[PDB]
Amino acid sequence: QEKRKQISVRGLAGVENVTELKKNFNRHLHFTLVKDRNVATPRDYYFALAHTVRDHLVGRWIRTQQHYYEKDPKRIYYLSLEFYMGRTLQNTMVNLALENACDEATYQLGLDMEELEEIEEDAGLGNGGLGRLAACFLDSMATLGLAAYGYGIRYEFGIFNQKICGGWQMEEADDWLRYGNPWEKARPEFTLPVHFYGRVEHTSQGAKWVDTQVVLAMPYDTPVPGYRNNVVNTMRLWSAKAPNDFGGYIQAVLDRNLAENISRVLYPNDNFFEGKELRLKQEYFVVAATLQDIIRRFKSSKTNFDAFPDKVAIQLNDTHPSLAIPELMRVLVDLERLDWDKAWEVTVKTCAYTNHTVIPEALERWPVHLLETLLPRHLQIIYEINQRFLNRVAAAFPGDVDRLRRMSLVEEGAVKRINMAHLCIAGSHAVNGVARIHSEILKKTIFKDFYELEPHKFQNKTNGITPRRWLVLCNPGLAEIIAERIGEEYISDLDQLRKLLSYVDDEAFIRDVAKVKQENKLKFAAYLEREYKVHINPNSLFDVQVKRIHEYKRQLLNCLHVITLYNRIKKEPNKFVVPRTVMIGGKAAPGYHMAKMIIKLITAIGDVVNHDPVVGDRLRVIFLENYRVSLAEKVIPAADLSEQISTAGTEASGTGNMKFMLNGALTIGTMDGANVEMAEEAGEENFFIFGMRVEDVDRLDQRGYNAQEYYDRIPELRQIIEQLSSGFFSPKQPDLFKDIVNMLMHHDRFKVFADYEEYVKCQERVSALYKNPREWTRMVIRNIATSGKFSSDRTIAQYAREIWGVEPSRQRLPA
Amino acid sequence: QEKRKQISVRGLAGVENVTELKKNFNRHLHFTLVKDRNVATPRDYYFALAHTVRDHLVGRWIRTQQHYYEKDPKRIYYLSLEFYMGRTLQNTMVNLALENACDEATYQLGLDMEELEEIEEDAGLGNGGLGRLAACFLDSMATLGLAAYGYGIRYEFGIFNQKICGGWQMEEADDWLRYGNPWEKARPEFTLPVHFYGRVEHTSQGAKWVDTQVVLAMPYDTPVPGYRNNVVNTMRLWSAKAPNDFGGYIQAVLDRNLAENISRVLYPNDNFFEGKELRLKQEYFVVAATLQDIIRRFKSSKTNFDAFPDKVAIQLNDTHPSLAIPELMRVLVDLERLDWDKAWEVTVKTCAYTNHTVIPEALERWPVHLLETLLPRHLQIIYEINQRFLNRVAAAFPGDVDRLRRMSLVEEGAVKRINMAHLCIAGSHAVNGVARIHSEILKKTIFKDFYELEPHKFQNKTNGITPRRWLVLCNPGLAEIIAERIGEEYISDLDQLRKLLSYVDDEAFIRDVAKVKQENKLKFAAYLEREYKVHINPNSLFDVQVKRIHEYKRQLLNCLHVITLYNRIKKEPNKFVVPRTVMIGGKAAPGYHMAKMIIKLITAIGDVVNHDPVVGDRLRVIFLENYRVSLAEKVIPAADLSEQISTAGTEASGTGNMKFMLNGALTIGTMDGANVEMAEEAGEENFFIFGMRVEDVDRLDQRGYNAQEYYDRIPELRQIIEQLSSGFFSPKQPDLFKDIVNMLMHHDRFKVFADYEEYVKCQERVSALYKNPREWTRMVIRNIATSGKFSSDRTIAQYAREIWGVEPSRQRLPA
Numbered sequence A, B: 001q002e003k004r005k006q007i008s009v010r011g012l013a014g015v016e017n018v019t020e021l022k023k024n025f026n027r028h029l030h031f032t033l034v035k036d037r038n039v040a041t042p043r044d045y046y047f048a049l050a051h052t053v054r055d056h057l058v059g060r061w062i063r064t065q066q067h068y069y070e071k072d073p074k075r076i077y078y079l080s081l082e083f084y085m086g087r088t089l090q091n092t093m094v095n096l097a098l099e100n101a102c103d104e105a106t107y108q109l110g111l112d113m114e115e116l117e118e119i120e121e122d123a124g125l126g127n128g129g130l131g132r133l134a135a136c137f138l139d140s141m142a143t144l145g146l147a148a149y150g151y152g153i154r155y156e157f158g159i160f161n162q163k164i165c166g167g168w169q170m171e172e173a174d175d176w177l178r179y180g181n182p183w184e185k186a187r188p189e190f191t192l193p194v195h196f197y198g199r200v201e202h203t204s205q206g207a208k209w210v211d212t213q214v215v216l217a218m219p220y221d222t223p224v225p226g227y228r229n230n231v232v233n234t235m236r237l238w239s240a241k242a243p244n245d246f247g248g249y250i251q252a253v254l255d256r257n258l259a260e261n262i263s264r265v266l267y268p269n270d271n272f273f274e275g276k277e278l279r280l281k282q283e284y285f286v287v288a289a290t291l292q293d294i295i296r297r298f299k300s301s302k303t304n305f306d307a308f309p310d311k312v313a314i315q316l317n318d319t320h321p322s323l324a325i326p327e328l329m330r331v332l333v334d335l336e337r338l339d340w341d342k343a344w345e346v347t348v349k350t351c352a353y354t355n356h357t358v359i360p361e362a363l364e365r366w367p368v369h370l371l372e373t374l375l376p377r378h379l380q381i382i383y384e385i386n387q388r389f390l391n392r393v394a395a396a397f398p399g400d401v402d403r404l405r406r407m408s409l410v411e412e413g414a415v416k417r418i419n420m421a422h423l424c425i426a427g428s429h430a431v432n433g434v435a436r437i438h439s440e441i442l443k444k445t446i447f448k449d450f451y452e453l454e455p456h457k458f459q460n461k462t463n464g465i466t467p468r469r470w471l472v473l474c475n476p477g478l479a480e481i482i483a484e485r486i487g488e489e490y491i492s493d494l495d496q497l498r499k500l501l502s503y504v505d506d507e508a509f510i511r512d513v514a515k516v517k518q519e520n521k522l523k524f525a526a527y528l529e530r531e532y533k534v535h536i537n538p539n540s541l542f543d544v545q546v547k548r549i550h551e552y553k554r555q556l557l558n559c560l561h562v563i564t565l566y567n568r569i570k571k572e573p574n575k576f577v578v579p580r581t582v583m584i585g586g587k588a589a590p591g592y593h594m595a596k597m598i599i600k601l602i603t604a605i606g607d608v609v610n611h612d613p614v615v616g617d618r619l620r621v622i623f624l625e626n627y628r629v630s631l632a633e634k635v636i637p638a639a640d641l642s643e644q645i646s647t648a649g650t651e652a653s654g655t656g657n658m659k660f661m662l663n664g665a666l667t668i669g670t671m672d673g674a675n676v677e678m679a680e681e682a683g684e685e686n687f688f689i690f691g692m693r694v695e696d697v698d699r700l701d702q703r704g705y706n707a708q709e710y711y712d713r714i715p716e717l718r719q720i721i722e723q724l725s726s727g728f729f730s731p732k733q734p735d736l737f738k739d740i741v742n743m744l745m746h747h748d749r750f751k752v753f754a755d756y757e758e759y760v761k762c763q764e765r766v767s768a769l770y771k772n773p774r775e776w777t778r779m780v781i782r783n784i785a786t787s788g789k790f791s792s793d794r795t796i797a798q799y800a801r802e803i804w805g806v807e808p809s810r811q812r813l814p815a
């Protein structure tokens, strides 16, 4: 399209720049891909453009790292088992101001750049929110000029590709590297050894970890460009490699695969702890290789370790890299020969821990037997940490023996375990939650004892999302009508969106906000037709719930609402209702039986609703297959209504909520996580808040949740449960949904029925406002305008000043 | 050195070419390696030069393949489980005339190009002679302008790296891809399915192979440049990849490794059949993927299959890819629906088979049970082939029932097997041996029945070696003094070396031949000091036996000679003997117990000889560690005496023999393999021929080989066996060599003692000529001058005219 080339936020198509891009495109097609235009496929053209764009990062990448060596600022190490990066081509072009020049260059070559973008695989190296947070954070730390390094694992296979077959999830390997990764640089020269198993021998200089099995950690470095500041930071992802030296010779060569399995695949659990030894190996693999880099970099700066916390921050993304704490003590005590107490002073000042859930089944509690086998020196260090930590509890709270038992890093039971959250709190100078309500729940419930011992350690860092990927990239139409009014500074200063409240009565802005949403809906509707032969009504309200399938997120509450709408149509067919396309998408963890049953129920509801001729185009229910970062970038800008309906107290923050608010959907939600702060920023009058508050959930927990009461008092609810039970949604297998019905009626930890009536009434209010396009749009303006707090630049600026002790800067490096 | 830049055979350092090379060097250092000269290692500089040199192949690679599409010549497919390629940087620079320009460009950048060359790993994708033959053949087919495609497996791990520890072989994984391969191009877009297991269902159009397990075959294409003719052919090596679709999800992702193990490692057997199922999978993997390419290419030319043998040659390198014959029948009958008889006519005209040994333990004889499980349709096709083939035997030789049993593709016994050599002969229009004596032994012994049925099928193709790698690359000093006299045409017309017989009395040539050998000896001697702290006397005769460790090659006969020299010195210490450095090197197969004992004996002999102060510098015995193509390129040009001492009738050809002759060593050898033809070319007066002839070995076999007779009649031999037995060479473990002594005395299939006396007397004649430098050199001139037959260009020109039906051409493509 010649229309999108007119988008000012996409930069200049400089005549010389366009000439150079076409030359470098053709150059890579010949020398890099070894093709000519006679045999070249769209995939070859995507790769030729990716190599051409990647060449523009290299000078800035080298100069940034040289700049950090020269200036020696404090270095931030962001340790995560997940980096949910998504694609890279568009993000690179946006951050380097190349997007219009590449669009023009490709257009002149006879190519559609948008079609080339759709060839790139997502770097799907995460599960959901925590993984994407790490990705938004790398982007914001580069935009804020921080000497920041993402450290993780280069999984051969990311989050599984979800297919829907027979209305059921099927999992397939995410072979994201099949056609290579043009962004990464392999660094085999910087390969480091990681040790497993073995035994401790305590001798003449102290402890020595011996008889270990070695796994090599080969780093792959990916550029992380800041927004037009010429900063390019690094994401370093470790790949597992068998050691050089060693069933016979052949079997021994094949058995190299066992060590190399450590980086093979991402564990697909979202908010659920699976205590697999292989997962523990992945956690130690990242920590051990990463801390070797950190220590070497420290020593090669302007050994004495007193300055180490002035030169190093380690941020732990969940407890996944919690072993950083005992590993740093092991390195400082066993190898550097520091006194325990000095090493401990260093460790706590270096390390900080971010918590992302209060759900007990999500928290890591490793069996002591497994730690003793795999990491014997780490277990000895953990026990020593626990004794000295509990000595401090005993001195602060003398004779509080129950507090000692509650706070211990060691959990007693049939299987003795290490509580990794307790280890993180003991070994960290800062502990944060990820939304105001969540950080308050930590201090009141799960970490109350720790908060009482060291109140100064407990912080809030409300989550955010990068307005590069999540507005300029995915919704250039909206970014453009905003820039037409307030210029471009908001792209790295999102609080300037508040200027848009001046436009609530501006006829042109009201027109343009609605026209951009409609354009996004028409494009998404086209996609569903072209890639899946699925028809959707583009004059319908796009009602979207996209996130991992989890009982706490209550896709089932959405299911009850959808069936309510269906049943209300059947009872009063002649009565006008606002047409809806209800879209639900997300992956279930492969072992999660209830999650997989919930996907089948969504598709089953579709099978009835979407073929009832009385309903026709008034209601459609579609399960969006393979929800991932690239699909988020398509559906979120097309959404009218953002479903954020977690049981109050269960969603720590959410970030999908923020994406929807930034892209011109209105929110229906509970007072949970960051929904509370989004409502506060916009005004509650501009949010569809419903249901129990945290205090109400607790009152139910105090008297006991009886789902039967709701069933007995609510005829419309009774009708739906009877439909599920009797087989209305599974006629060939009438008892198919018995496990969902049994859970809802007798074992529902998330109180789905308790929010049913307020949810349905709230949804009526949504439909009422949608009937008034002008007032729907004015309320959208009030949401976009107040979305500025939810920039990850705001979040990271708080991490930098309140935890890391570094001052962010938006100032550009030279050219 | 500024001296080597003066070598005219290395081409011109054009001022613009040097400028462009430095620019592209710096460009790759920045954009490809993402380094600056502050952090750059010699390894980064090697890679920057390799990418710069590889860029010069690309235009010619694309134009050559386009040329073959346009001209549609008959295509030659050279199927091998082994491509022993060695390095690629120097070979590329030689074949493109870039060597002086790159040397000057690197010199101007402050770099030693020779030091950069030593960083490259060898592509060690073969065991020995057959693997290297495939490599020389690709080089010669490109130099002769043939539309030729090498097809094989991209082993992740090539021939194991040999370390010597405690004087014993140790094996380590050949991780040749650790730092990447800058020559290859991955072609994941051309990935093809290969089928295993399953079952046959015979239905309405005939047979269907169903319920199979799929392994994908991902091609990696490597350029093969001809000598200065602008031809760049392709070596396509298949990599195993798990199919896209499928213990739980995690285990299923890890279990992808099982399919991917097919291309993991080269089976390290030289001249020995190991009937491992994994090896059978590798063989079928290469054949099935390769034949899909061949069929697709055929159909996309200027379906009717009558023309297929006019457009396709398939050359089978040993029986390793013998399944090509039943696979082609399976494709033509089951998928293309040709009548059996028409398919068979096509198959036999397409296929030809090269044999490389008569040793029964080297020949492939697959259990029918294993073929029935892995390849049920292939076994059915083999049985059908066998019936029709034996019907023809019965009609040619009516009532010869023993001939039927002898010729059958099916071998009866405890375990019924398929004789893959019989399948190849039945399914091939040509069968060749690899030296005149070997091809005669095939027609007289092992394949006599087949020769009687179809005499026209049996050919000779005497082996050769490329005079690019094996003279211009490895011995530029010798290539230069030759070019100074006869110009450069000999480099692709090696029979012009006969012109050097005009120089047998030329004082300057005699001086220069000796000066080049001395330069090679000084350089190799330096290497042994620098890389292994090993001292060798450069005024000693360099006596070299380098080849795989095998009883038939009789490294043990060399061992007896070395101990004879030691014992003669000790008996008459004051008597002058020509000082020798006796070098033995080669790998033993990991399972081969006798081979591994023989390496230990060589190092054990060293431990005594090299520390006896009575001997000092008069005799040294060194085991050359990790003998491979790159080390062959160093030691062969430094050699005085080439040890080629196989039992007459056992070495099919040899090619190391040819390398030594071309590089100015004199040969001590039996009348075996190509040694016979080398002696014929040079005159027997210019070779140290000794020992039993094939006829003499047979007379011993007829009366029975009694090693005791030799022991009883030869006092010097008795003394050595008593030293081995008593522990003189293993004092801490006196019985260490009991297995060697027992084999020599009672179970020696290779008659080591029977050649002992003639071997020692022949070695005295070698020492006598070495005392006369002028006459040693004149005899060397007579050897180099007559080495021209042993060019692989001669060999391939014969394959092309006598088997493939294509006319070779030395004419250049444009620029």
Ligand SMILES: O=C(O[C@@H]1Cc2c(O)cc(O)cc2O[C@@H]1c1cc(O)c(O)c(O)c1)c1cc(O)c(O)c(O)c1
Pocket (backbone or CB within 6 Å): A112, A114, A115, A116, A118, A474, A520, A523, A524, A525, A526, A527, A528, A530, A633, A634, A635
């Ligand atoms: O369905 C269309 O795109 C798909 C949906 C979609 C979206 O919802 C938001 C977004 O940021 C990008 C986006 O790319 C999708 C897409 C898929 C392709 O296979 C493709 O070739 C392409 O150019 C793009 C489409 C149809 C159109 O008719 C059209 O003109 C167009 O530009 C695009």
Ligand SMILES: O=C(O[C@@H]1Cc2c(O)cc(O)cc2O[C@@H]1c1cc(O)c(O)c(O)c1)c1cc(O)c(O)c(O)c1
Pocket (backbone or CB within 6 Å): B112, B114, B115, B116, B118, B474, B520, B523, B524, B525, B526, B527, B528, B530, B633, B634, B635
């Ligand atoms: O031992 C020397 O080289 C090694 C042996 C050797 C050979 O025998 C033949 C040949 O084709 C090449 C060859 O490269 C070897 C070599 C090893 C290295 O590590 C290296 O850096 C190098 O430049 C080379 C050497 C010593 C020298 O003193 C010298 O000047 C020299 O140019 C080379």
Ligand SMILES: OC[C@H]1O[C@H](O)[C@H](O)[C@@H](O)[C@@H]1O
Pocket (backbone or CB within 6 Å): A128, A129, A130, A131, A133, A271, A356, A357, A434, A463, A651, A652, A653, A654, A655, A673
């Ligand atoms: O903190 C980032 C994210 O981590 C986890 O996904 C939490 O469940 C989610 O609420 C949070 O927003």
Ligand SMILES: OC[C@H]1O[C@H](O)[C@H](O)[C@@H](O)[C@@H]1O
Pocket (backbone or CB within 6 Å): B128, B129, B130, B131, B133, B271, B356, B357, B434, B463, B651, B652, B653, B654, B655, B673
């Ligand atoms: O034909 C190439 C080579 O194949 C095998 O290695 C044979 O043992 C050898 O004699 C021959 O020269």
